A and B are shown apart, each in its own frame.
With several copies, the nearest count.
Chain A
Amino acid sequence: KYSGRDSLIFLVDASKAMFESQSEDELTPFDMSIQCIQSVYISKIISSDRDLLAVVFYGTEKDKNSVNFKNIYVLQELDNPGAKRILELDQFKGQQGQKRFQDMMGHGSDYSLSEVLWVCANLFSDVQFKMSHKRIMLFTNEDNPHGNDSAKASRARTKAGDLRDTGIFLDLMHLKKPGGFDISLFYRDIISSKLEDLLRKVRAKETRKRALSRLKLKLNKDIVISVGIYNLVQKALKPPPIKLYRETNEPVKTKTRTFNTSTGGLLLPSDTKRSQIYGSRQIILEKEETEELKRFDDPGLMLMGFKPLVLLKKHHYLRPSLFVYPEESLVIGSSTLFSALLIKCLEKEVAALCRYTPRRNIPPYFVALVPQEEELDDQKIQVTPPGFQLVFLPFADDKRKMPFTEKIMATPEQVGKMKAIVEKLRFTYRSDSFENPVLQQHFRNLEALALDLMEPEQAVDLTLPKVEAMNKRLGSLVDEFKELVYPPDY
C-alpha cells in the first residue's frame, strides 16, 4: 500500500542478572539496550517520521497494562517518535539510572511467559490505522526460560505460533554471556548478536514510493499505450522554515494583499494586467494571454522513429533521467507490446526517439528512450529493474561555445609514470556512503536542540581526502614528476 505505516515494540528483559553487571567491569546489558533503543528513536525521528514505536519491559516488580497482568509494565504507547518520549526514556543510564529504575518500578520478580506477547498483541490490535509490517524486537540473554515448568514452555511455543498465524514476526536481538556468541541454544520454534545496525547506519534517509506522472505513448496517431513515468534520483534537501511567534510560540498564519492605487481601498486581479517594456514602448497583455502564449500540444509521448545507440553521447544530458514502466490499468494489454518492443530493442541495440510534453500546458521537449535489463541473484541483487530510461537532450541554446583554440601535445614519458600513480591509487569506487555534509550537520544540529545534551557534534566530513595518508600511499615521486617536465624555476 501507499498509506500503510509500520510498527515496532521494543521488549526489554530485566529479570535478575541483566540489571546486574553480570560480574563484569566493561559494559552492562541494560544500559546497552537503552542505548540501542534511544539510537533507533533518534534515527527514525528524522528518517521515517510517521511510523509507530513503543517500549515495554517485562519481569519487573510492578505491573501496569490494559488488562492487569503480573510483572508486565509499559512506558510509552504506539505513536510517532517524540522528543518528550526520548527525554523520558533517557533517564535510565548508568548505575544511577539503574537505581532510579529500581525506585520507579523495581527489578526482580517472577517473570511470566507468553502473556507478555499477548500484551504486545493487544498493543498491535487496538490502533485505527493501516499496518504493513509487524515485528517485535526482543532484548534478552536467557536462551532457556523454562528451567522449572513445561506448561509455560508449551504455552509459549503455542502462543508464538498463534501470533505467527495472523502474521506477526518477532526477532530477538541476542545478548552475550561472555561477550560473544556462546549460548548455542535451540529456539527453532519461536523465532522466524549484531547491534551496530541498530546503532549507526540510518541517520539520513526518507521513505516513499510514488509515480510523478501517468502518460500515454502514441506510436502512429491511433495506437497508444499507457506508461507511468517514475523518478529515481530527486536531490533531497532540508525541510522548510515554519514561521512562529516570538512570545507564545504558535503558528502565525500570515496573509497577503495588494492595494493602494493612490486611493486606498482595495484592488482585485480583474483590475490589473501584465506588461513588458522595450526601450520606449510597453506591451500590455492579460494573465490568460500570458498563460495561452506557451502552448504547443497536449501532454504525452509522440513517437518519432528509432535510432542506434551510438550517436547520442552520454556527455549530452540536462536533467535527472526518469524511468518509464507499462501498466495494465488504462489500456489492457500494453505489457505485451512493451515486452516485445523491449526484447527487440534489447537484441538489436536501438533506442527510440520521442517528443515529450509533461502536463496540460508545457512547450515540448525531445527525449530519447534507452532500454535496460534486470539483474538478481541468491542475495536478490535487484539493482537494475527492467524498463526504459528517458535521456533528455539539449536543443540549440544549451550547448555553449568555448574559446576552443589551444593545442600543444605531450612527450611519451609522463604517461607511464601517471599510469603508475593512478594504479597505486586504484580501488573500487563505492556502492553508497558519500553523505551530504551540510545536510548532515543540520541534522545533528536539530538533533542536539530538543534534548539539551548541548554539545553540538561536529559533522564528519566524509567527502574530504586524507593527504597525509595519500602522500605515503603514493610514494616519493611528486618532485620527480614535477622536475620531469614542469619545474617552477622562478
Chain B
Amino acid sequence: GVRCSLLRLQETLSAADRCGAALAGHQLIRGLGQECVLSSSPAVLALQTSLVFSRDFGLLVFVRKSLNSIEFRECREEILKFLCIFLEKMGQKIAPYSVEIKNTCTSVYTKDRAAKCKIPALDLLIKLLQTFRSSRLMDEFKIGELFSKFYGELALKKKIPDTVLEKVYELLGLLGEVHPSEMINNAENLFRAFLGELKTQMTSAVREPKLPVLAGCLKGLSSLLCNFTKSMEEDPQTSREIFNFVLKAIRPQIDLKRYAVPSAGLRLFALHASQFSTCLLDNYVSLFEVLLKWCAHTNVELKKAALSALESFLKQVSNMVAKNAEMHKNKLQYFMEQFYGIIRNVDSNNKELSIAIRG
C-alpha cells in the first residue's frame, strides 16, 4: 500500500509490451491522487510529503525514467496534473521540494512534443513562481535562464498551438513581476515584443483572431506593468498606445459568447489606471456607457471583474478632477446628475446603485 505502489510504478517500466501494466500504473497514480488528498490530518500529510520523494523510487524519478516512451503519456500527464494540486494541498511547507519540481517542469516541457503535456507543465511552473514570490528561494531558481530560454522559444518556427503561447506570454510577465532584481535591463525589448504581437493580432484584415493569445498577452502585460512602469511623465507615447489597445479590447461587441478578453482587458485597466494621465479625460462618457453596460452581464467572472475597473476608474478620475477644479464644471455636474439619475431610477439591483453611492 505505502511505497510498494511507488516501487511497482518503477517496475512497470522494464517489461516489454508496457500497455496493460501501463493502465494498471495509471490506476495506481489515480489511487495515490485519491489517497493523499483524502487526508484530514496533517501528520500523515507531512509524512507523505517526504514519503513521495525518495531518490531511487518515486513519482519524480519515474518521470525521470519515462522519457523514451511513446505510450507513456496518459500517466505522465496524470502526475503533472497531480503536482498542480500537490503544490496546493499544503501551503508553503513544500519548500525543500521545489527546485526539483522546477527542474522536472523544464525537462518535461523541453523534451516532449504533445500539447496535452506542455500545458500542465507550465501551469505547475506558474503556480511555483506564484507561491514563493518572497525574497527567499529565488536565486535558488535560476530566473536568469528562464528568460533566455522562454524568450528564445518565440524567435523560431511556428509550431506552438497558441494554448502554449498563452502560457508563454503569461510566464514572461510573471518573471518580470516577481524577483525583479535580475531583469532590470532586458525589459526594453519585452515591451516591444508585447506590443507588436498585439498590434498584429488585433489590427489586420486577414486571418480571423486567434483568441486566447490576446488573453495571454494582456495578462502578461498586466504582470509586467509593475516595477517597470511607463506612465505619462517619462514616456507618454507607449502608454497612449497601450491605452488605445485596451480601448479597442473593451469595445462592446454584441454577439460574442466566450468571454475571456473582456475579463483580461478590464482587469488590466483596473490596476494600472494611474499610468494614463491625460489620455483619460476625453472619452469619459463612452467609457461610462460601456462600463455600465458591462455591469449587467448576468455572469460570475465578468461583472465581478469589471466592477473593479469601474471603481478604480472613478477613484482615478476624481483625484484628477480635483486638482484643477475650475473648468471641469460640466464634467462634475454631468457625473453628479448621472449619479442622481441612477439613484432616482426605480430598479431592484443591489450592485447597480452601490456604484452611485460611492460616486
* A residues in contact (CB < 8 Å) with B: 255-259, 266-268, 270-271, 288, 291-292, 361
Contacts and interface: CB of A to CB of B under 8 A. Distances in A.
| Most A Cβ at <10 Å: residue of B192, B205, B206 | B206
B157 interface: yes
B193 A288 contact: no
A399 to B, nearest CB: 33
Contacts of B192: 268, 270-271
A276 to B, nearest CB: 20
Interface residues of B, number: 16
A256 B157 contact: yes
Contacts of A361: 206
Interface in B162-198: 192-193, 196-197
A274 to B, nearest CB: 14
A288 B200 contact: yes
Contact of A268 (B193, B206, B207): B193
Contacts of A255: 156-157
Closest 10 CB pairs of A and B: A270-B196, A288-B204, A291-B206, A266-B155, A255-B156, A256-B157, A268-B155, A257-B156, A292-B206, A256-B156
Contacts of B196: 268, 270-271
A288 B156 contact: no
5 contacts: A266-B151, A268-B192, A270-B193, A292-B206, A361-B206
Contacts of B197: 270
Contacts, number: 34
B96 interface: no
Interface string B107-135: 00000000000000000000000000000
B150 to A, nearest CB: 13
Contacts of B156: 255-257
Nearest to B113: A253
Given A255-B156, A271-B192, 6 more contacts: A270-B192, A270-B196, A270-B199, A271-B196, A288-B204, A288-B205
Contact of A266 (B152, B200, B204, B206): B152
Contacts of A291: 206-207
B206 A258 contact: no
Main SS at interface, chain A: mixed
Contacts of B146: none
Given A270-B196, A291-B206, A258 B155 contact: yes
B155 A267 contact: yes
Interface in B136-165: 151-152, 154-157
Contacts of B206: 288, 291-292, 361
Interface in B195-217: 196-197, 199-200, 204-207
Nearest to B154: A268
Contacts of B155: 257-259, 266-268
Given A268-B193, A268-B196, A270-B197, A292 B205 contact: yes
A386 to B, nearest CB: 37
B200 A270 contact: yes
Contacts of B193: 268, 270
A329 to B, nearest CB: 23
Nearest to A128: B19
Contacts of B205: 288, 292
Nearest to B205: A292
Contacts of A257: 155-156
Contacts of B157: 255-256
A167 to B, nearest CB: 27
Nearest to A254: B157
Nearest to A259: B155
A259 to B, nearest CB: 8
A464 to B, nearest CB: 45
| Most A Cβ at <10 Å: residue of B155, B204, B205 | B155
Contacts of B151: 266
A252 to B, nearest CB: 14
Interface string B270-287: 000000000000000000
B26 to A, nearest CB: 15
Nearest to B152: A266
Contacts of A256: 156-157
Contacts of B199: 270
Interface in B315-332: none
Contacts of B200: 270, 288
Nearest to B203: A288
A286 to B, nearest CB: 9
A257 to B, nearest CB: 6
Interface in B73-89: none
Contacts of A268: 154-155, 192-193, 196
